[PDB]
């Protein structure tokens, strides 16, 4: 029971935070997001997960070292020289996949949601053939490709992966399970497996099509990032009420680090993730904010809906609003109005931004 | 001696403010703009002295009378049914002028400065012609009078009530002292004074000129008043080095009513002239502001180049710049931002004003 995830890659939507860090790596909820599918996976129960690191492949590697001990199931990296594509990973560990003969998963990095698996597999082994698709829908189809999806068996009439403006509203959750016989299929070259062999495959109507409970998000873009952690913090309010901290200055879903540090006198709002090692001084207010580690906010601020990098400090009287991106290691002066910039790492901010535009 | 000040103007430049209370009632540095005037007419050893407002408001009426035993002086006053410029006042009231054979003072209500009261009478009475007017230089002319002053003998050559052509540096700074003679050449049909007597007194020689010592500004515009208050407070400082509050938390040259509040752990920057009984709460950062009576400013927000008018109610995290002005008995709720945005009286705002705007 071997299981895939394509990541890496360069992560281009993300930027601001991606300049530091890989994607898979940057925190999600106190956790990274590939952390997350891991847990996953391991939960369900794998004994091999195959993981292809086309990015920087040190600090992506070593973090893998240390949690296949905590998680006490073996993990192995393919990569490459170059850039295969996201399908030439499955070209690349053809051999890996080929002496068993087990159907396996295939998951995208930047995918956070509920996960299905198992009930996956029942449905797979139902349905009998080589591919399944995991399919949610979702209101804006030109983001992510669309599948036509019929009632009972849900063969896929009709695939496209680059969706037009009215043609279908259930979308690819990009979550897949593929057979050993599709590799014979894919070639060594870089392709892309989203485009290429769901085109051909939807041709001979192997496809077939599972749907999803609940809050299916991307974290790839750094809206779409916030979006999902709303969406995810109201998921676990549903699930571990316990996990999320009450105060009487916390109002709403708030997951607060252990290590993280909340000062007096202060509103946190709804929505907000603090990481590890933070602290937050008296009288700040922060409402759909995502705080990654070691991170100082001074008095007297206000924060909505913005992404705090890694060893950020935001002055004192600082007023962030409209995804305001800060990477790693960012110094934001006192006194200062920032609205929709994305500020790349280790700079300093001398003056306000009125209106989005990228801090060089 | 006698003195008249033209008041009229109910819609001139102060709007908001004005909109609740006549012009020369509104505070500026914790004193009305014609009690400033009134004072350093009592200085000055006027006898009585007359305001020409062209609108009836009762509590000014109230005012006044309540004022004239503090001060010594009888105040009256005179209306005209249409406003006949503002020549038309020294018309309208010249048997009171032409009863004395003494020079008498005209003032504009705007106007404030250091005021050379017996230095100017004395020149009027050295000089000895029909009409004594005193000028200082600015740097832009355009909006002002502009005289050309002969060397040393104070002489004016040439009075226009507009440049255009760039005829002389120094403008008048609204300040006449004129003779008894000078009220025959005026007539009770309306006119206006420095556009249309001012020049052919100026064409026989009759108009002299004294340049003043130090910070004439006009307090008609609102962006004019705040920088008005801040000259103010320096020129207040080196005479008056103890009345301007000193503290910790206090930076730079404020001026605190000592019935007003200022709370914990907070920074009040330069040039801030508080009101009496306004209450400043935890972490409040103001600059560059004024803040009239009775206005409550809750904790942790930041104000800077603001007017805050009568009793108001200034949210938490509320950030305030650009000249922006409140009316009075306006209530900001918290988490907003106001970039400037005039606000009308007795108006309750629950949106943030991203560019210059006016708000009923
Ligand atoms: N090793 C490797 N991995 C790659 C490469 N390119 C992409 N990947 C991995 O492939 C996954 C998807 O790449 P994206 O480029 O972010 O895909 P997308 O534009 O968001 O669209 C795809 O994902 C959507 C769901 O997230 C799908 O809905 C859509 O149809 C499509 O499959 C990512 O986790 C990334 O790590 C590569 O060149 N090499
Ligand atoms: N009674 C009455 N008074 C008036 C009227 N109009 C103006 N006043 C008063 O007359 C003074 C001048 O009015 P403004 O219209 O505001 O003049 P300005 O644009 O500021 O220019 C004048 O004053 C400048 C200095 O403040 C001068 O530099 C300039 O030469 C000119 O005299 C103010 O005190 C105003 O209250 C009126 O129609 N009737
Ligand atoms: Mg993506
Ligand atoms: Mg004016």
């Keep these: ?42 939960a369900a129960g794998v004994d091999h997960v195959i993981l292809a690191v086309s990015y920087m492949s040190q600090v992506l590697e070593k973090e893998m070292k240390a949690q296949e001990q905590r998680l006490g199931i073996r993990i192995s990296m393919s990569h490459e020289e170059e850039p295969l594509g996201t399908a030439g990973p499955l070209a690349l560990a053809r051999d890996l996949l080929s002496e068993t003969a087990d159907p396996f998963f295939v998951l995208n990095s930047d995918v956070i949601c509920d996960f299905p698996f198992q009930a996956m597999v029942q449905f797979h082994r139902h349905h009998g053939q080589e591919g399944s698709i995991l399919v949610t829908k979702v209101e804006e189809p030109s983001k992510y490709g669309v599948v036509v999806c019929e009632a009972d068996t849900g063969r896929i009439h009709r695939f496209v992966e680059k969706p037009q403006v ?8 990009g979550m897949y399970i593929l057979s050993p016989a599709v590799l014979q299929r894919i070639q060594l070259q870089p392709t892309s497996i989203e485009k290429e062999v769901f085109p051909i495959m939807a041709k001979e109507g192997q496809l077939y099509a599972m749907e999803l409970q609940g809050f299916w998000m991307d974290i790839g873009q750094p809206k779409d990032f916030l979006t999902g952690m709303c969406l995810f913090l109201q998921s676990l309010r549903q699930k571990q009420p316990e996990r999320l901290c009450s105060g009487p200055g916390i109002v709403g879903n708030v997951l607060v680090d252990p290590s993280a540090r909340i ?12 990481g590890p090692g933070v602290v937050v001084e008296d009288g700040v207010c922060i409402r ?7 991170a100082r906010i001074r008095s007297h601020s206000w924060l909505e809906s913005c992404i705090v990098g890694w060893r950020c400090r935001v002055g004192q009287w600082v007023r962030m609003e409209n995804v305001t991106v800060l990477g790693e290691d960012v110094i934001v002066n006192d006194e200062l109005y920032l609205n929709g910039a ?6 300093s901010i001398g003056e306000s931004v009125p209106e989005p535009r990228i801090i060089m």
């Excluded at 000062?263 to 603090?274: A, K, R, Y």
């Excluded at 994305?342 to 700079?347: G, I, R, T």
């Design 288 to 294: 759909r904010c995502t705080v990654l580690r070691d």
């Design 263 to 274: 000062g007096q006198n202060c509103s946190i709002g709804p929505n907000v993730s603090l």
């Design 166 to 173: 009215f043609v279908s509203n259930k979308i690819n959750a």
């Design 342 to 347: 994305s500020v790349l790492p280790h700079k």
């Design 1 to 42: 029971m071997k299981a895939l995830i394509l990541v890496g890659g360069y992560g281009t939507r993300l930027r601001p935070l991606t300049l530091s860090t890989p994607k898979p790596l940057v925190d999600f909820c106190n956790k990274p997001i590939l952390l997350h599918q891991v847990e996953a996976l391991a």
